[PDB]
Ligand binder design. Structure first.
Ligand SMILES: Nc1ncnc2c1ncn2[C@@H]1O[C@H](COP(=O)(O)OP(=O)(O)OP(=O)(O)O)[C@@H](O)[C@H]1O
Ligand SMILES: [Ca+2]
Ligand SMILES: [Ca+2]
Ligand SMILES: [Ca+2]
Ligand code: NA
Lengths: 358, 122
């Protein structure tokens, strides 16, 4: 009390205080190199003089020096909070390597002098946030998409699937689609423009072949104008649904891995048959890339066509989908029973970074 | 250790807690079965096996007007209480008006509902 909640992602950092409705400070997980030194949005504005660095790739920390800088910026510049005076809740990807779990614990205690910390699996926090202890979470962010079967509060690690296609790949796909139109979005800022185009204008086609026919005939019923920062207008037509379609058919961008629905189906099949029924009934979407309109209905139809006859399929798509991980964490670290769940400074000093394991 | 966990599953019977501002608070026995539709509850049913051991069924009940912190806490409390019971409890998610026959059978005169409840912890 009061616990700090930090959800570290491949592209975005979700941070705030335990007991809040939402994260108060949401900023990109980027380091700007003209060490570091520019961190956050300030590395996006003065990006013309710097080169961008991402300490987290596909949900996994690959640079601990830069990661440690993101944390310092999170505490000092964003939350404006002394970390040695607060317990800190962190998040990790499913199947996170133990070396990174120990390094994360080491940094918090040794570099930040944190009184107490705890690490939660992201998918689990999302399920909790939806008010469930059992279900299959489809976490889909900027750098990685995870399919996590969870039973009675614990992930089933052998059934977890991972695909490295996500939001960033979709952004580049849209850039590719705009390239064949004559445009040349290539720079740092230009990539950010297209990303905004994707978030604002895109949607999931219920029937892709039918929508593709519709856009080629009644084109006016799909076309939307987008105002570029220079004032010019670009027409966006079939790109609106062709871009997020790659989530269901990755072959569009030249990937061999199966689509979102197939990968979820195979995870369910890797689970005990006695729980598959409950998993179909509790499919929970999380992450920014699951925000596309009509994605819940599309997935629902896809899963039904794969599932056994008369199987009940429910896809839950919470409006706060982008922050479900943080929210689940805020609730978790606010509970009266979580006081004794923390890993204390005392427990670290006589066990080391190997303390995270239980 | 949370004092309510220590009271949990000591003997055959029915135990009900209501989530109140990020905490588990025991419902007074005379109010068992009368659920605030604006709240979330945790219910432990303990049954003596025919061999000395105890049987555990954990039911978390979600009112239609309960807030996200309450429903979230109820699910988390359920896992934590199951952990305390060495994972030997079977967990059940109960929705208002769609409760399982087992959960309904716990209350002889049937489930009652009433508007209102404790305010959100958020
Ligand atoms: N309204 C929206 N529609 C479509 N996509 C969106 C929307 N909002 C955000 N996104 C996408 O979500 C991605 C980031 O989401 P999120 O923060 O959940 O992932 P992350 O944690 O940063 O990355 P990862 O989870 O892969 O480590 C971005 O690529 C962004 O394009
Ligand atoms: Ca994430
Ligand atoms: Ca309430
Ligand atoms: Ca159990
Ligand atoms: Na179900």
């Amino acid at each position: 009390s009061i616990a700090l909640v930090v959800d570290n992602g491949s592209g975005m950092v979700k941070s705030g205080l335990a007991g809040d409705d939402a994260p108060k400070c949401v900023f990109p997980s980027i380091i700007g190199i003209p060490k570091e030194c520019y961190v956050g949005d300030e590395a996006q504005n003065k990006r013309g003089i710097l080169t961008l660095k991402y300490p987290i790739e596909h949900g996994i920390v690959t640079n601990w020096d830069d990661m440690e800088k993101i944390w310092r910026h999170t505490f000092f510049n964003e939350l404006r909070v002394s970390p040695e005076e607060h317990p800190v809740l962190l998040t990790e990807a499913p199947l996170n390597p133990k070396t990174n779990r120990e390094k994360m614990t080491q940094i918090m205690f040794e570099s930040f002098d944190v009184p107490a910390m705890y690490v939660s699996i992201q998918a689990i926090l999302s399920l909790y946030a939806s008010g469930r202890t059992t279900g299959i979470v489809l976490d889909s962010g900027d750098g990685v998409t995870h399919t996590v079967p969870i039973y009675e509060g614990y992930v089933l690690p052998h059934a977890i699937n991972r695909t490295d296609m996500a939001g960033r790949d979709l952004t580049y796909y849209m850039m590719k689609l705009f390239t064949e139109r004559g445009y040349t979005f290539t720079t740092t800022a230009e990539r950010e423009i297209v990303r905004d185009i994707k978030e604002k204008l895109c949607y999931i086609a219920l029937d892709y072949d039918e929508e593709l026919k519709k856009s080629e005939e009644r084109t006016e019923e799909v076309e939307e104008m987008y105002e570029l920062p220079d004032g010019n207008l670009i027409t966006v037509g079939s790109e609106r649904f062709r871009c997020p379609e790659a989530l269901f058919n990755p072959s569009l961008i030249g990937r061999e891995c199966p689509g979102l629905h197939i990968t979820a189906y195979q995870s369910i099949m890797k689970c005990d048959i006695d729980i598959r029924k409950e998993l179909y009934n509790n499919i929970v979407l999380s992450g920014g890339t699951t925000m596309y309109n009509y994605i819940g209905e599309r997935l629902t139809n896809e899963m039904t066509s794969l599932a056994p006859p008369s199987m009940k399929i429910k896809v839950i798509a919470p409006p706060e989908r982008k922050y479900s991980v943080w929210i689940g964490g805020s609730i978790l670290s606010s509970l009266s029973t979580f006081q004794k769940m923390w890993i204390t400074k005392e427990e670290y000093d006589e066990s080391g970074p190997s303390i995270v394991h239980r | 250790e949370h004092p309510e966990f220590l009271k949990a599953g000591k003997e055959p019977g029915l135990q009900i807690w209501r989530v109140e501002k990020f905490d588990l608070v025991p419902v007074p026995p005379n109010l068992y079965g009368d659920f605030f539709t604006g709240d979330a509850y945790v219910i432990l049913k303990t049954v003596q096996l025919r061999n000395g051991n105890l049987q555990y069924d954990l039911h978390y009940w979600l009112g239609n007007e309960c807030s996200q912190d309450e429903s979230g806490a109820a699910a988390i409390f359920t896992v934590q209480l199951d952990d305390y019971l060495n994972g030997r409890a079977v967990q059940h998610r109960e929705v208002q008006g769609f409760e399982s026959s087992t959960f309904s059978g716990y209350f002889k005169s049937g489930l009652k509902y009433k508007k209102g409840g404790v305010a959100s912890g958020f």
